[PDB]
Amino acid sequence: EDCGIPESIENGKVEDPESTLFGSVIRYTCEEPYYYMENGGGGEYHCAGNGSWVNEVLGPELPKCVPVCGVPREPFEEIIGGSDADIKNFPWQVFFDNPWAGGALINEYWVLTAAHVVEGNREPTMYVGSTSVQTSSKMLTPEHVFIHPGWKLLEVPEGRTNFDNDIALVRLKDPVKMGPTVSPICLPGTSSDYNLMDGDLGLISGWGRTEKRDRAVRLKAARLPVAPLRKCKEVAYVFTPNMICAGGEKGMDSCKGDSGGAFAVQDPNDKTKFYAAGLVSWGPQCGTYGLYTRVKNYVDWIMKTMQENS
Numbered sequence: 001e002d003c004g005i006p007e008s009i010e011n012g013k014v015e016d017p018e019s020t021l022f023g024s025v026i027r028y029t030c031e032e033p034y035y036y037m038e039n040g041g042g043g044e045y046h047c048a049g050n051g052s053w054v055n056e057v058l059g060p061e062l063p064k065c066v067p068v069c070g071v072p073r074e075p076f077e078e079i080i081g082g083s084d085a086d087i088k089n090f091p092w093q094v095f096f097d098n099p100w101a102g103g104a105l106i107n108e109y110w111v112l113t114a115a116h117v118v119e120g121n122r123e124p125t126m127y128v129g130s131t132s133v134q135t136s137s138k139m140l141t142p143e144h145v146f147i148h149p150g151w152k153l154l155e156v157p158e159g160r161t162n163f164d165n166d167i168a169l170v171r172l173k174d175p176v177k178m179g180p181t182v183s184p185i186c187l188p189g190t191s192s193d194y195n196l197m198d199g200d201l202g203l204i205s206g207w208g209r210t211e212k213r214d215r216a217v218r219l220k221a222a223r224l225p226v227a228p229l230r231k232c233k234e235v236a237y238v239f240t241p242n243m244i245c246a247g248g249e250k251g252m253d254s255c256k257g258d259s260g261g262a263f264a265v266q267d268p269n270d271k272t273k274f275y276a277a278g279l280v281s282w283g284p285q286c287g288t289y290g291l292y293t294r295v296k297n298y299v300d301w302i303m304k305t306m307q308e309n310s
């Protein structure tokens with residue numbers, strides 16, 4: 001008759017039941033707003049006659065709580081020409097110290113970044129959860145680096161002129177714990193709703209060079225519009241449809257050290273979510289325009305890489 005004190009789940013909670021005996025009920029809830037319940041129709045279990053807590057969809061199996069993507073706890077208010085940002089405004093931001101660069105957390109086991117950030121480093125050191133840079137808040141241990149196979153490997157990577165396919169995934173050894181300072185960004189969908197248009201606005205964030213300091217100790221961010229690829233060309237370099245051009249306004253721009261950070265765009269179907277439309281890749285002189293890896297063109301590759309390396 002006794003189903004016993006319910007077992008806990010990661011990133012969820014079950015309230016203490018008044019009774020653990022036959023016919024009692026319990027309800028699992030995920031740690032909101034950072035997690036939600038995957039499928040698992042309701043999280044409600046009754047104590048069955050055979051002594052198991054049973055859910056009508058999952059049977060005796062316990063629910064799974066999974067990260068909510070794209071929703072900062074504090075919206076950004078008002079990198080060249082940027083202003084101070086808090087890691088709570090960009091909780092998906094990852095800091096790489098070798099080399100100095102950024103990335104974007106996309107789920108509890110995966111960081112998205114530019115290929116040129118990890119092309120020289122099989123075991124990149126990464127940090128999340130801090131408005132301030134750091135070296136050796138939470139340090140993330142990598143498990144494996146997956147560089148896109150269309151990225152051209154170079155004997156002398158400085159002086160690259162072909163940044164096509166500038167994208168990489170880093171699988172993490174341990175699941176990242178989400179909270180007010182750490183949470184993933186969403187990915188674009190594959191529908192035409194995610195075809196960026198000239199003038200569409202997004203946010204960039206990073207610790208790269210600013211107009212007054214060679215790097216930034218504390219996070220900066222700026223709002224930037226998409227521009228025709230032509231504008232970037234006009235400022236041997238290769239330009240492809242896998243690159244977004246953005247910038248041109250008020251001298252706001254990404255710069256050296258912002259590499260791999262997300263160009264975060266409000267989701268066209270859910271205005272409260274941000275998705276990674278671009279990754280800081282390369283550009284001409286800082287303070288003009290920048291090129292960003294068009295993440296939408298890689299969603300299939302991203303999904304396949306994660307599925308086959310679970």
Ligand SMILES: *[C@@H]1O[C@H](CO[C@@H]2O[C@@H](C)[C@@H](O)[C@@H](O)[C@@H]2O)[C@@H](O[C@@H]2O[C@H](CO)[C@@H](O[C@@H]3O[C@H](CO)[C@@H](O)[C@H](O)[C@@H]3O)[C@H](O)[C@H]2NC(C)=O)[C@H](O)[C@H]1NC(C)=O
Pocket residue numbers: 047048049050051052054056057058059060
């Ligand atoms: C206790 O009994 C439950 C079944 O619950 C019984 O029926 C409910 C409709 C209610 O009336 C309850 O009050 C009643 O006691 C057993 O659950 C069953 O567990 C097995 C595995 O242990 C499940 O099989 C698996 O299902 C997955 C997903 O579908 C398959 O992929 C697997 O291959 C495997 O077959 C089975 O589906 C599940 N039954 C239900 C209805 O969910 C429970 O195991 C049992 N516990 C003990 C200790 O006896």
Ligand SMILES: N=C(N)c1ccc(N2CCN(c3ccccc3)CC2)nc1
Pocket residue numbers: 116157158159160253254255256257259280281282283284285286287288289290291
């Ligand atoms: N005007 C921008 N928005 C801009 C300017 C430069 C830039 N860079 C990052 C990539 N950099 C690099 C990295 C490895 C090898 C060779 C070059 C060059 C600097 N990013 C954006």
